[PDB]
């Protein structure tokens with residue numbers, strides 16, 4: 001029975017999570033500071049997220065331990081301790097959203113990316129995100145709370161003084177706030193937007209790669225049309241497709257060799273010289289094996305690197321959802337099913353631990369998925 005025993009377990013697990021969350025995320029921040037190849041806008045959002053995770057370990061976890069005792073407290077002081085973690089969760093959602101959008105600009109408008117997405121603007125965005133996060137997570141302190149209807153028997157039983165409550169999460173934070181405002185509007189909607197941004201990212205990477213492959217089969221389909229053609233009207237036709245395809249590819253060092261050759265051969269076809277156009281078009285086979293093939297596979301290789309980075313970002317966002325959704329779903333049962341008995345305490349505490357674990361996991365993702373983080377991690381440790 002002794003509540004101190006079950007409490008001892010919950011506390012030592014929370015403290016273990018805290019140590020890990022602080023250590024791992026301190027290493028992320030140190031790595032970005034030391035390695036100028038990690039100083040890019042994407043990674044300022046990683047740092048902001050790492051800073052939220054550090055604060056989970058230093059403040060949210062000590063707060064959660066404190067609030068699990070039900071200690072007597074002025075109700076608004078209780079709300080701050082109860083709600084501060086909602087600030088950190090929101091800040092995380094905003095950083096994750098920013099990363100998604102960053103990776104989308106990078107892949108869908110590489111033209112204007114560096115031009116549109118700068119480091120001083122990113123800092124301004126992060127500041128605004130933290131301010132909003134405070135405003136959302138501390139909204140119960142503006143009056144959307146249960147401080148005006150305190151549980152007087154619980155306060156008396158605990159020996160609390162005048163104008164104090166027993167400080168327990170569900171006693172002071174209204175469940176309509178947690179479900180409608182925090183979960184549906186501030187968590188769920190952003191996560192679905194994120195899901196939409198990632199669907200768009202992977203679709204765009206796919207269309208771009210089909211195109212590269214498409215333009216490439218066209219240059220080749222047409223080069224066999226030319227080589228087996230009989231009428232001259234055909235050479236013109238097939239070589240005309242190579243040109244257009246040659247420019248899309250250029251857009252999508254020595255393409256001007258390729259286009260110059262098509263142009264040479266084109267003029268021959270129009271002047272009725274089929275055998276010499278066919279032979280001139282044959283030069284196109286060399287410049288392809290020396291240049292055009294080169295654009296192709298490096299473009300393929302850069303594209304795949306961006307998809308890889310986007311996958312890494314999506315995993316981090318998926319793991320956030322996974323760690324936090326159970327608590328939100330429990331709150332939905334509590335709120336929407338009064339006829340149901342309340343989820344038991346051991347499960348409440350498992351869901352809280354699970355959410356806190358999220359703050360440990362990201363450094364491992366970085367280390368296993370991003371070579372530059374991993375290399376920087378290994379150097380720091382020596």
Ligand SMILES: CC(C)CCC[C@@H](C)[C@H]1CC[C@H]2[C@@H]3CC=C4C[C@@H](O)CC[C@]4(C)[C@H]3CC[C@]12C
Pocket residue numbers: none
């Ligand atoms: C960078 C840091 C060290 C700056 C200084 C932080 C100080 C002001 C903080 C850290 C710990 C805090 C204390 C933590 C707990 C309590 C108990 C509460 O019933 C009254 C406030 C009181 C006594 C706090 C007062 C402010 C405090 C002393």
Ligand SMILES: CC(C)CCC[C@@H](C)[C@H]1CC[C@H]2[C@@H]3CC=C4C[C@@H](O)CC[C@]4(C)[C@H]3CC[C@]12C
Pocket residue numbers: 072073074076077078081
């Ligand atoms: C944020 C950094 C710089 C400092 C550490 C946070 C400090 C300010 C936090 C940590 C714990 C908090 C306290 C927790 C409990 C109580 C008792 C309640 O009856 C009034 C509010 C009061 C006194 C809180 C005031 C703010 C507090 C002291």
Ligand SMILES: Nc1nc(NCCc2ccc(O)cc2)nc2nc(-c3ccco3)nn12
Pocket residue numbers: 168169170178327328331345348352
């Ligand atoms: N419902 C809930 N409870 C708690 N803590 C108190 C757990 C509890 C619940 C009932 C009870 O009688 C005694 C203790 N922390 C909580 N944090 C959250 C939360 C954060 C983000 C989403 O939900 N929900 N939440």
Ligand SMILES: CCCCCCCC/C=C\CCCCCCCC(=O)O
Pocket residue numbers: 058059062063066071072073
């Ligand atoms: C480098 C230090 C990192 C760890 C810092 C942890 C500091 C935790 C700060 C506050 C914990 C909350 C304690 C509140 C106790 C209230 C007790 C009371 O109301 O009488």
Ligand SMILES: CCCCCCCC/C=C\CCCCCCCC(=O)O
Pocket residue numbers: none
């Ligand atoms: C991050 C800054 C850390 C600075 C050190 C802060 C140290 C204070 C930590 C915990 C204090 C909580 C003690 C609560 C005692 C109240 C119980 C009581 O006496 O009735």
Ligand code: NA
Pocket residue numbers: 049052053088089092358359
């Ligand atoms: Na987080």
